[PDB]
Symmetry: C3
Subunit: 308 residues, 3 copies
Amino acid sequence: KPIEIIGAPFSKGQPRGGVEKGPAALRKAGLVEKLKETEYNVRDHGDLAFVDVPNDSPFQIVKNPRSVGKANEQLAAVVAETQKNGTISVVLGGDHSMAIGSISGHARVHPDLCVIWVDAHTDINTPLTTSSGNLHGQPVAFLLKELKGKFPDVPGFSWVTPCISAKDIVYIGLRDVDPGEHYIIKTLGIKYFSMTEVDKLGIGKVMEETFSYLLGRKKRPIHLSFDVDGLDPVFTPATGTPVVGGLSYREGLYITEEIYKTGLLSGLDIMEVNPTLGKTPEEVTRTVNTAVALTLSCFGTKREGNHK
Amino acid sequence: KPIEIIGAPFSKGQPRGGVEKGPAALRKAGLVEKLKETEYNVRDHGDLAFVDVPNDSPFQIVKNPRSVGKANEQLAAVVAETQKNGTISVVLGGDHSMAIGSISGHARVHPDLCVIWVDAHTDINTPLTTSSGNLHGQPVAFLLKELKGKFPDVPGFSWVTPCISAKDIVYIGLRDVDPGEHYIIKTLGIKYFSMTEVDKLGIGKVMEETFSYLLGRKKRPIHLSFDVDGLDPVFTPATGTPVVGGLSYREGLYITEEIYKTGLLSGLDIMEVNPTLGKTPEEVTRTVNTAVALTLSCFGTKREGNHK
Amino acid sequence: KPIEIIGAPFSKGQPRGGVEKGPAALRKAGLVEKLKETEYNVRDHGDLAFVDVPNDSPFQIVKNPRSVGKANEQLAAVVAETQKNGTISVVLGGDHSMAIGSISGHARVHPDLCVIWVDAHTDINTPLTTSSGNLHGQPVAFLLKELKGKFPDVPGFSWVTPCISAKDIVYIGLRDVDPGEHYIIKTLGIKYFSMTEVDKLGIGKVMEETFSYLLGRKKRPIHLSFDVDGLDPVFTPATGTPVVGGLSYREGLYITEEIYKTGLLSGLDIMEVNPTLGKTPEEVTRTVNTAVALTLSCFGTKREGNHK
Ligand SMILES: N[C@@H](CSCC[B-](O)(O)O)C(=O)O
Ligand SMILES: N[C@@H](CSCC[B-](O)(O)O)C(=O)O
Ligand SMILES: N[C@@H](CSCC[B-](O)(O)O)C(=O)O
Ligand SMILES: [Mn+2]
Ligand SMILES: [Mn+2]
Ligand SMILES: [Mn+2]
Ligand SMILES: [Mn+2]
Ligand SMILES: [Mn+2]
Ligand SMILES: [Mn+2]
């Protein structure tokens, strides 16, 4: 089984443009080289050439709808094509709005996949509940079967088909959820482990519980959408929406080590790394290196060591 | 059920006077506004006008006995009056010596209440075991039935009646206990979870265990006396007696979230916040904001989110 | 039962010479005074006078073989002599290469002892697997019965006899293990709790599990070899080989508190403290004080308090 890195230098899912540099900063930290030292064969697609839409007025409150919807249609066609060739897609972001295209394309080939969304946010606001309009806080909304028809058709997303149900996803890290989002997860009954559940159970029992909940009936492809701001700002400071009291460095590596060991990882997203959001140069380095470490962990590297 | 904020700008329980500014710094951080956004109706009594006692020589080694004993007699009459009107008292301190008056008044209306004392210290030295004389490290001593008559009558505290027994309180966070205090808790058999027990069990099992121990027989009013230095100096640096290896931000919010969910919180203290003890302006901001967050957590705010 | 502090100002087990100052920095922090306040009688042997070997060319890749092998032969004779007099040896290092002599001498008197190696590294590279040649990352190699004859005879270590088997040791803290080391621990089946197992189980269950594994059949002398870089660089920054995502201050004290409570501690090492590796003066102070605290914890001091 081979790996396929797909760079997604996109930022129109939020205000700050530095995220577009996430793919390159991750590559400069030696990501591909290090991944080639693991047990997998690594292929590097390169970065996607995102087509900008000049005339892109806000859809009501939704901003850059057409630029975002197009950028994701491209990504979805590339992930599906790589998934079609039996390779594990590894998407390096921009903003988390790229998960729409990452998961959509993936679910075309493995419609039975489940989603492990690591984030301090649920990113499940719809065009009608969002208060900012930033589409990086709405991906989950465009992906859920149950939320289909709950908001008006957004320009640029006609190609989108909600093919993943609320029972196929688990959240880990939540600590900053909007009122509408909380209402949505409770009504639809989306499984989650906010920081409260992590403190209550411990990361160990948390992973055991998300696997039994998602892989209890039958084993299936796993799509991990890791938002760097899932970890505490002390570890991943270079992100546009840091929330205090998050997952630790250790807890993050635990999550990935466990997903690795399942043997089911099929798709992976490393989102929201913004190399221009460091208070100090070292804060950017600390963030990048942590993202690279989490990515490697997903593909073999264990803290107990490794050997051939 | 309504909430009642009672400011207690008192500092004569220890050396440093900045604590008297704790109530105002907490209000400046938007405490009342934020509390009014929760599901409770919030009333703000204001700050107590503490009568200073000019001639207040040390009782043996005890300092400012009369000023402290008077200040607490006032507070006790106000908390009892608010408790008498079916409202939840929320006392913002100074030093922890104000817990004597906070709990005493509370126990007049709910003599069946239990106490969850979150602190890095036991604050159970008596006038005869204390080595500093600072009454903020002796409140528990003036409140316990079993410790009545174990030390001579201190001027200013004649109004005090030890109405809470050693079996009604649980400690969480302990990591700096004096020899006499350790002897006292072991002889009286006061339940506690020092940092050792938190590391052993995990905060989750710790709360489950203090609730079963205190609310096992019958459910009763809970009085939470939270000492800001209960959390690690990394979170609550602006306190006069910080000890390393304390509760985390996450663990602190867990404690309050769980007390909230019990539906039994009857009285609350937010003590030892000293807005003049910050190494840097941000350390003061970090401390205040954490105290405000813990207070809000006690009244509804959950990390998983909320909605109407 | 008495305690015996044996200073081991040695650094030839690695590049940086500051470690030779570890014993003195620890004494300057008031170690002996504080240890004399515990329930034990404390004896201070002083620092060993290490004989330097002028002509000491690398054995193949192994550096300072003869200087290290001699320094440890001395230490082994002193620890065995103190162990012979029924006292608990407390060796203050330099580099971890001194554990060879510390444990060897100890095992002469208590050949039934088990080893609790707290470190971010396994220090089990042999003269043929090591890539650096630094003997502080090879002690365990010269001590294991199963690894006898697996590498050529190193000058300076003829006196060495591997008397401890792979089933008598448990590792805690691992997060930076070499390929050969990982192969060695898995083939020999050495018990370990890397950071992954600590996150999975919690430090509490981790200690319960190492005690049942090592003291299940019969109770026996415990030799704790604590490498300061076992804790996160945030607590013990002044070490030559810091790895991120390590044990916390709390977790470290937990380990020692539990070993204390077993009543079986027979030998103890406080290694890799380098008072010249502080980014700032406070980082050195933070490291020393943490090492002193861990040492005291091993001899009585509990976070819940103490009394006579
Ligand atoms: N609640 C926020 C969502 S911020 C989420 C950002 B990120 O993609 O990093 O999770 C909103 O409505 O914009
Ligand atoms: N053991 C100390 C008590 S310091 C406690 C301070 B605080 O109120 O913050 O817990 C003494 O005798 O002054
Ligand atoms: N893997 C390293 C070992 S570094 C271990 C250092 B210390 O003694 O602190 O554990 C090597 O071959 O030099
Ligand atoms: Mn996100
Ligand atoms: Mn996020
Ligand atoms: Mn206190
Ligand atoms: Mn305290
Ligand atoms: Mn070592
Ligand atoms: Mn080490």
